[PDB]
């Protein structure tokens, strides 16, 4: 029954910003964490293609408090993930985008993940639908 909704992606110039959000219904998030993942580019190329759109990576994370986060390296400095505890919503604030930024992204749920910042998609019980975040050069 819990239910995660994506927002917030769209078409953007390199070096411009986005703000995604993720609504999560159907249940109480008083434990775990919340996090974002994306598409992950498997072949290294700098494209998502063939079925790289099933393979996953951690982008960002946040405890259900939001008193702690993590990141993936070539983020930091760039995004910065937020929640909202009273609305159960999460945000990622996505600045300074890059062209190989682009992908979707998948709101993700982890209501017993005891280490606040769940980093593997395994250890994820929920996950949203993705939005899709295309950044142009
Ligand atoms: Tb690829």
Do not use: H
């Not at 249940?27 to 190329?45: E, L, V, Y």
């Not at 393979?55 to 400095?77: C, L, M, N, P």
């Not at 209501?111 to 606040?116: L, S």
């Amino acid at each position: 029954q819990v239910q995660l909704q994506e927002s917030g992606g769209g078409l953007v110039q390199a070096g411009g910003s986005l703000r995604l959000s993720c609504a999560a219904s159907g249940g109480t998030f008083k434990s775990g964490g919340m996090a974002w993942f994306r598409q992950a580019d498997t072949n290294n190329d700098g494209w998502i293609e063939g079925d790289e759109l099933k393979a996953r990576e951690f982008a960002a994370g946040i405890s259900w408090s939001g008193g702690s986060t993590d990141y993936e390296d070539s983020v930091k400095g760039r995004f910065t993930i937020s929640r909202d505890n009273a609305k159960n919503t999460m945000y990622l604030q996505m600045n300074s985008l890059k062209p190989e930024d682009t992908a979707v992204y998948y709101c993700a749920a982890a209501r017993r993940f005891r280490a606040g910042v769940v980093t593997r998609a395994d250890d994820v019980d929920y996950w949203g639908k993705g939005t899709q975040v295309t950044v142009s050069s």
